[PDB]
Amino acid sequence: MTEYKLVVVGADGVGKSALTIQLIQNHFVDEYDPTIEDSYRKQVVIDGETCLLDILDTAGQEEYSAMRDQYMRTGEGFLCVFAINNTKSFEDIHHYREQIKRVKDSEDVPMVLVGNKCDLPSRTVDTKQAQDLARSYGIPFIETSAKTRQGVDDAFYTLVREIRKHK
Amino acid sequence: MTEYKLVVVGADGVGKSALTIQLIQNHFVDEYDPTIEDSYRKQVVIDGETCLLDILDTAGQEEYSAMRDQYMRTGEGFLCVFAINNTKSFEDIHHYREQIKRVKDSEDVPMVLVGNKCDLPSRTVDTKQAQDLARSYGIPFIETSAKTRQGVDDAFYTLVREIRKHK
Ligand SMILES: O=C1N[C@H](c2c(CNCCCCCCNCc3[nH]c4ccccc4c3[C@H]3NC(=O)c4ccc(O)cc43)[nH]c3ccccc23)c2cc(O)ccc21
Ligand SMILES: Nc1nc2c(ncn2[C@@H]2O[C@H](COP(=O)(O)OP(=O)(O)CP(=O)(O)O)[C@@H](O)[C@H]2O)c(=O)[nH]1
Ligand SMILES: Nc1nc2c(ncn2[C@@H]2O[C@H](COP(=O)(O)OP(=O)(O)CP(=O)(O)O)[C@@H](O)[C@H]2O)c(=O)[nH]1
Ligand SMILES: [Mg+2]
Ligand SMILES: [Mg+2]
Numbered sequence: 001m002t003e004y005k006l007v008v009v010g011a012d013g014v015g016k017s018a019l020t021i022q023l024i025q026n027h028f029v030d031e032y033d034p035t036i037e038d039s040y041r042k043q044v045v046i047d048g049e050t051c052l053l054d055i056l057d058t059a060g061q062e063e064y065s066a067m068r069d070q071y072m073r074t075g076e077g078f079l080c081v082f083a084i085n086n087t088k089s090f091e092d093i094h095h096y097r098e099q100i101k102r103v104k105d106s107e108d109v110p111m112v113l114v115g116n117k118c119d120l121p122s123r124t125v126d127t128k129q130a131q132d133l134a135r136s137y138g139i140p141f142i143e144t145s146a147k148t149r150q151g152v153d154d155a156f157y158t159l160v161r162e163i164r165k166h167k
Numbered sequence: 168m169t170e171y172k173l174v175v176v177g178a179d180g181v182g183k184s185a186l187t188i189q190l191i192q193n194h195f196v197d198e199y200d201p202t203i204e205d206s207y208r209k210q211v212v213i214d215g216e217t218c219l220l221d222i223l224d225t226a227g228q229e230e231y232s233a234m235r236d237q238y239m240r241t242g243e244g245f246l247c248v249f250a251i252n253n254t255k256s257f258e259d260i261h262h263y264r265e266q267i268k269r270v271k272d273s274e275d276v277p278m279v280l281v282g283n284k285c286d287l288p289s290r291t292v293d294t295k296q297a298q299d300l301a302r303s304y305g306i307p308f309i310e311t312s313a314k315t316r317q318g319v320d321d322a323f324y325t326l327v328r329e330i331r332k333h334k
Contacts, residue, residue, distance in 0.1 A: 031192075031193070033191075033192070035208075036209070036219070038205075038206065038207045039205060039206045041202075042203070043203065052203065
């Protein structure tokens with residue numbers, strides 16, 4: 001069985017854990033419990049192929065910024081998550097992408113730009129701006145909601161297709 | 168900060184995942200999703216000491232019986248779980264105990280016997296029988312419910328106290 005090593009990255013509070021928990025447990029976590037580092041091994045069927053997703057739910061807190069190098073080295077694909085109502089989280093994407101590109105020593109790293117909390121009316125980042133940034137990176141962009149499940153399966157499955165399309 | 172590697176072991180369906188998820192997320196999972204291998208890191212305060220719990224939620228399914236050797240070598244303490252309404256799960260306990268003791272080459276391995284699903288009225292395993300088995304092992308015995316949260320914090324904290332004694 002083919003294994004896919006996925007890493008969920010982004011600023012503290014964007015919904016990395018809620019997106020991961022929504023995908024696996026089909027429920028929305030309203031509580032904010034800062035992550036140190038959690039991992040999940042889940043068997044899924046993507047495009048008729050049964051595969052194992054090894055998902056790493058990382059810390060957004062800058063206090064764990066030294067843990068990054070090792071998980072970026074072993075990670076095969078990166079879900080770069082920002083919140084559509086948090087401008088700093090969108091700006092932080094560039095830093096996460098540059099660090100991934102540095103560690104991996106490649107400009108062609110499987111990545112998906114994720115604009116989470118798309119259920120919220122308090123938007124600060126235009127869809128077109130996020131789309132343009134994803135285009136400058138040459139990566140897909142998906143708007144998601146860990147609450148409604150909108151784009152959640154699509155974000156994770158697109159990332160697997162990116163790793164597969166790269167291999 | 169002191170780290171404690173905790174391994175949750177036991178028969179398929181005893182509530183290893185529900186106990187782990189209840190401890191960390193303060194949420195009861197009603198669904199039965201067989202585990203491959205999940206890991207969680209949680210910062211807690213035990214007896215005035217701030218520590219990090221590195222919890223491995225293992226597969227109860229006999230199909231992943233080869234994965235055991237590695238995590239039994241690195242695991243510092245083991246939560247051995249059975250369900251009070253499942254006689255076979257209680258009988259399987261001695262097999263987990265005997266494998267841990269074999270891999271560690273010691274009869275003094277930090278362990279806690281856990282009697283889960285104590286919220287259920289359909290009991291088939293007597294508390295006295297489980298207490299007597301824990302006594303033959305020289306380990307603590309705690310009855311728990313991943314649904315009500317009864318004994319959950321006590322089971323994990325007792326295990327940490329067991330590792331601290333051994334160290
Ligand atoms: O020595 C062991 N440590 C593991 C363990 C953990 C940490 N859990 C995770 C597991 C790790 C495996 C790898 C693929 N599963 C974890 C996983 N999924 C990923 C997805 C993307 C990128 C990296 C990873 C990783 C990690 N693998 C790396 O190389 C790596 C680099 C930097 C990271 O920060 C994270 C990872 N907690 C425990 C508590 C008690 C007992 C054992 C443990 C473990 C498990 C096991 O069955 C047998 C032995 C061990
Ligand atoms: N409305 C809405 N709220 C969300 C969404 N995703 C996450 N949240 C909320 O945002 C808060 C933070 O979510 P969380 O999943 O813990 O974010 P995180 O990026 O993992 C935080 P850390 O980096 O510290 O681990 C929570 O209160 C959660 O309910 C979403 O898609 N929509
Ligand atoms: N009433 C009650 N039900 C429980 C309790 N703990 C677990 N369950 C239920 O038992 C079922 C299986 O629980 P689960 O946590 O997946 O057990 P597991 O030992 O992890 C199964 P696997 O070994 O395959 O990973 C679920 O439906 C769950 O809700 C409990 O304390 N009380
Ligand atoms: Mg988180
Ligand atoms: Mg389980």
